Amino acid sequence: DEAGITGTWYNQLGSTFIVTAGADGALTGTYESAVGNAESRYVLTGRYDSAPATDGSGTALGWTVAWKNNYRNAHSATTWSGQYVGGAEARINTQWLLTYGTTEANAWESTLVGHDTFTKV
Amino acid sequence: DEAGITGTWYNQLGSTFIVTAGADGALTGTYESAVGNAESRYVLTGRYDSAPATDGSGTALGWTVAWKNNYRNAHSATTWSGQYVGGAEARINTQWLLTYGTTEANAWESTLVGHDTFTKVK
Amino acid sequence: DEAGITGTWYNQLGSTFIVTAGADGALTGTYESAVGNAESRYVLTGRYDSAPATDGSGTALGWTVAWKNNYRNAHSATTWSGQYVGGAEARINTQWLLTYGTTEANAWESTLVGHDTFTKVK
Amino acid sequence: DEAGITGTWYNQLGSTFIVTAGADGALTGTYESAVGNAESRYVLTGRYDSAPATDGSGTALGWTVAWKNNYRNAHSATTWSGQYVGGAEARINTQWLLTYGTTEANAWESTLVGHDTFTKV
Ligand SMILES: [Cl-]
Ligand SMILES: [Cl-]
Ligand SMILES: [Cl-]
Ligand SMILES: [Cl-]
């Protein structure tokens, strides 16, 4: 649980996700994107189910990155929603929503959707 | 900004979203859902753009709730992604993803998607 | 059902959706978008459940528009997925995915998601 | 274009997608799901960009299946939105929305989202 999730993760684009899972269900850490208007690390914070079912199911979790740090601001935020799966091939499988700030007129085009799979590599 | 976002919000389902926005970009608070396998408040945490553009654009933000508290655990988590819009009729417009724990064979059906609009008045 | 769905619909952006529902479950018509890189009508095609439950549940449906017509080509396509709800205030509530052609390096940013609500009155 | 898309496709779950692309941008065919409340083939219909950019970009397309056929009805419909990518490893990369009919009270839980990658295998 806590131990399985804590540590470094990499996704299929080469991005780096460093996270600490608290016994209380907290996720905290940093994210570094291999793509987009991003450089160096960004703060992340999220939550995970700290007492998952014991029927073979994954562990639900989610986190957010606002794409502002000391280097740049891309006026956007991404949330990843998914589940942690344990085993020899531990994975965090996610889908994500990236919203950027828009005028109300352009609200219809404010949100991208995609999917990331993270491995300990 | 920080002052605009902090406080109590309500969505179209009758859910209650209570949040404090930090100067650093943090969001912290609690969420109470009017629907689903949920009761009472749940911890939420997230992030918002603490230095948005000044061109009339909204403020990007997101937050997460894991649906476990001292009363219930629905083995699932929702992330809201959207933007805060100031002015007279302040709103937070979001789309969300709800993932629940599944077996690997059932992963394809693990995630719901929807949209919530939050305002300051009941 | 077939009679309820067939005809002209309007969404919250001012777009116009004209559709014919077939007895077999087919949807055929045209879409005119009030926003984006689009002008005039575009062909749409899709499917709906021609034998829905009779328990008060909505009618599932979906359709696709590729944003090429005789005037413009925006190298993109939108799919709407949702349900038709009958009764006095008939609506089609949808969420949509818009994908545009990208290079492989840019695929991660190829798809927008949103929601449209269609009604019969302007 | 037309030739690249037409034919049989398989996704990562083992589902089978048989499609004919028309010169006019039409997609027609059948879908057979390896999972869910589904058996045998279902009608599909969709659209694709019949004159894509020539800058290396993929070909945008989308299609719908309503999960009713002569065998069963699952009171739901899935739309796939994505792009066709040519080459030695031709792929149709998609994201999808599955909506099932619900009461208005339960509308909030009516729609699933996911992703499918199709190959000619
Ligand atoms: Cl069992
Ligand atoms: Cl104004
Ligand atoms: Cl009623
Ligand atoms: Cl160039």
Numbering used by the authors:
A (entry chain A), D (entry chain A): 13 to 133
B (entry chain B), C (entry chain B): 13 to 134
From the paper:
Introduction of a biotinylated monophosphine palladium complex within streptavidin affords an enantioselective artificial Suzukiase. ArMs result from the incorporation of an abiotic cofactor within a macromolecule (protein or oligonucleotide). Inspired by a seminal contribution by Whitesides in 1978,32 we report herein our effort to engineer an asymmetric artificial Suzukiase based on the biotin–streptavidin technology. In summary, incorporation of an electron-rich phosphino–palladium moiety within Sav affords an artificial Suzukiase for the synthesis of enantioenriched binaphthyls (up to 90% ee and 50 TONs for 2-methoxy-binaphthyl 8b).
To gain structural insight on the second coordination sphere around the Pd moiety, crystals of Sav S112Y–K121E were grown and soaked with a solution of 1 in DMSO (for details, see ESI†). In the resulting structure of complex 1·S112Y–K121E Sav, there is strong residual electron density in the 2Fo – Fc difference map in the biotin-binding vestibule. The Pd atom was unambiguously assigned as a strong peak in the difference map (12σ) with a corresponding peak in the anomalous difference map (8σ). The density map clearly highlights the presence of the phosphine ligand, the palladium, and the chloride (see ESI Fig. S5†). The amide linker exhibits two H-bonding interactions with the protein backbone: the amide nitrogen exhibits an H-bonding interaction with the side-chain of S88, and the carbonyl oxygen exhibits an H-bonding interaction with the backbone nitrogen of N49. Inspection of the X-ray structure of the active site of 1·S112Y–K121E shows that the Pd-phosphine ligand is effectively “locked” into place by the steric environment of the Sav protein, which is evidenced by the discrete atomic position of the Pd and P and their relatively low B-factors despite proximity to the solvent pocket. Furthermore, the conformation of Y112 is effectively locked in place by an H-bonding interaction of the sidechain oxygen with the backbone carbonyl of E121 (distance 2.88 Å), which would not be the case with the similarly large S112W mutation (entry 18).
